[PDB]
């Protein structure tokens, strides 16, 4: 009205892993160093306690404890987004309020997973979560993980809420997303690194990326080259970071980002169970893809 | 060695809804009345805080608070199984221990959902959960909800753990389940009412049912008729309760069981968000199926 | 009215491979020897030019040429069913008429594949195919191959046609098939060997089997043991032939049956392209499963 | 070497419907008028007897009969591509040779459908089809219809054949297609109108389109605007023709193009069974989308 999601939330965001100490405890120090690193590499925004941040296995206290550690570290020169979504509506209301109290710049609310609620339950869920805080709220539609999509009718109905300002899409329905962007003006962020460039063509605002952990610089130049009309360079850069997308397919984001950051000298620990760290064979394969993406050696 | 899952855990179990007061609070009183009702109707076992018990939206305290309320009510003449599974391994370890401390007769551990861990993460997860307690542990394989299956190799590896004694299957891979039963001797329970009779033919031990909320008597006679070789009667009874399976397809288990119990005079409240209670049109459709199953009017 | 599909079409049918000479020509002689073999092993019916009979790669002339070769060989003591289904309605009308002219005992019409017609196109298709001949017509519902299912409403509408008498189900919707059998009285045949026993429990009439090529005797005893109420023996026999179902999963029916028959001394040739014959590694794996099923060595 | 697929086969191709007379006969006259219309509207290439051309329900003679009618009509100022793919390798060899004898400019070979051959069968199939003619051959990968994909390893192996020059992709794996284009230099054509613009961003050469039947002019300007770096105009035009993509989702290409052409004054007949023509309700919905795309009234 007129909100600017590009400035409010960013254009190159990394869904940051939650670093853990050698014993498994929350490592606030490694979080700030990685937060400064990702911003210094080209990220104007960060998502904390997203999917890749191991939100399933971190407590309410550790989430707020991480949120301030990232805010005081990079909150001056970068936007900080807190993931406040569970399969529990009342819990999501407390998390979004507490994240608001700590001064997070935005909210990322994932589709309630596992329980497979009907669409009107999802609309009532998101409406209640968007009511809890005057922060800008991003819809996070990932049916491959949550077992239900946000249907296009549900997204359009929630588009009229003043706090719901955009969608982080891991559904890959580019034709539907392109029409929702044009019709309602919601800002779309690619929640799928493999489709970053197709999403820009559809009109997306930016990336809430995973391989930005290891290649935020190239992704920044991809966004720059696409906005400046040089599509051949964005495609050239997208082919360059393609091997990191292949490695994410083999490993998944949590295992990839933690094993990849260690090979870049930035040890962030190992994932909490039921997630596991990369095997030696997976590490060597990850490194070959990273040497292909010119982000190793 | 030789464990008897049929006696240890039961043969007709209802994944009991968690009743809620008119304000949304945990209703321990309605839980006992429903627990006595389900046992008096033919259930020799009960599952508390399963999928249908709205485990996503109930606290750790409310789960233990419900567990004792059901144990003191029916624990003498029925087996009580506590669902202790999340996408958080350490949380599942605390829940399974606390449920053990309260004297639950068994554990139901669902495949970690949403985060999509690899198979070796699942094996390490379940192994750590089975280590936490000498209770008999049931695997709960529902890839339609959790977004990952327990592969047959993973089930067989976990079959050698002394506490993992069986599988609640909502995967419908009857050919694989039949071979796992024959090879490892794990007890299978139908986690899909629509496939109750096909599962008995494959060798299942019983039902961890949802429509038993409304038709536990007929399901008991189905198990009786099948064990006594009268397959035509079990099939006759399965056709009789088929409309309740159709209604579960339209509504889902949580909405169906709560709306259905109210129409049977046993008001248990409404589901917690993001789940919703049945609409008037859904209630009238549910009633027509229930009148077809001869469990209404 | 009252038709007896069990006598009209059979109870143990093999979707017979179409044998080919060493040069790829139609081998009528090997067809009769295999037809006599399958009947002498326990099959009271046969399907010619089905999916496993390589209907995609055989001409109209070779189909009729095969139909008479099987009729004169076993048509006295066995039922012969001709597959007359393509994605071409008018072609299916000529094939079903010509198969009728040659005295086939029934028709097997597959869901038109590839072109994905809407349901009313399917209903109009099957209605026109059932009109062309007063032979008993079997619906063949295999959405995994044809890319569209026959919805339950379509099957029920086609159930009132006097020539459409049953369904060969490769859709695995046991709950829907059980209700269609009870409501309309259509005869169901398992088009999925892995679900043969679950289909009997649902009320199926028999098997239109693939692994019967190699284990028709055991399947006959499975049908006998299930009809005589001995479910534990049918399950014991189903576990015995389970390795052949695993091999069919790896290879597919055409490659499995031709490579398996050669190892049983009954060489029937190699499949026509785009299908291929088993590799040496696939042959050795097939043999290990066949030695497990006690149908080799 | 260096082939120019953009000139050899075109950049805006319409998979042309096969027009039929009022009695169902092949209408060569309506084919030429539509062929001249589509070229005069901006199509530099045409595909005959593709999926949308009702290849399942047209004879070998009618296909060649249509091929010459389109060649003599527009073969001077447009490229004509003949679809020569079935689930029958030897049949595909005769069709591709006969289409070559009639002077078609290229071949479109679809993945063998229904029979689900393994990958090495597909590689051997396409290799044998590419051997039959020195025409440029386009791979057509549509697993949603054919029930098997062409795996990326299969496409790369077939990329070294001199006659296989590109891929018509209806698989939507933009990340894989982008890497195959960069690695092997195969020309990709969007076989999915909804993903036309994402495919251009990935580097596709053009569209083998369906909604070009009704909006070839706008699609031409979309290709022009994208090649000239004006991405915002291509996206503006893609949103304009989006309602035609929605109508194709409801109807399918054969029903949409024939019902849509009639509303544009160019009656081409009705589809052959098992396909059906649009219902009055479907016609009115199609017209509303066409009035939205500014291609009606
Ligand atoms: O690969 C996935 O399923 C998650 C990718 C989107 C990144 C985001 C997030 O972790 O919140
Ligand atoms: O329909 C489902 O997805 C759950 C059915 C299995 C019942 C059990 C459970 O609720 O734990
Ligand atoms: O495995 C398949 O897809 C076919 C099995 C059903 C056998 C019949 C048939 O070949 O017609
Ligand atoms: O929508 C489809 O499945 C086909 C679209 C691609 C057009 C081509 C073709 O008809 O050959
Ligand atoms: Na959707
Ligand atoms: Na919708
Ligand atoms: Na599995
Ligand atoms: Na496995
Ligand atoms: Na169906
Ligand atoms: Na239907
Ligand atoms: Na593929
Ligand atoms: Na591959």
Author numbering:
A (entry chain A), B (entry chain A), C (entry chain A), D (entry chain A): 4 to 300
Provide the authors' original text about this structure.
It contains an N-terminal (α/β)8 TIM barrel catalytic core and an α-helical C-terminal domain19. The active site residues Thr54, Thr55, Tyr143, Arg148 and Lys171 of Mtb-DapA are largely conserved among its homologues.
The structure reveals the presence of α-KPA at hydrogen bonding distance from the residues Thr54, Tyr143 and Lys171. The Mtb-DapA and Mtb-rDapA-α-KPA complexed structures superpose very well with an RMSD of 0.3 Å, indicating an apparent lack of conformational changes in the protein upon ligand binding. The proportion of inhibition measured at different concentrations of the analogues showed that the IC50 for α-KPA was 21 μM and the inhibition constant Ki was 32.5 μM at 500 μM pyruvate and 400 μM ASA. Our results show that α-KPA disrupts the oligomerization of Mtb-rDapA thereby causing loss of enzyme activity.
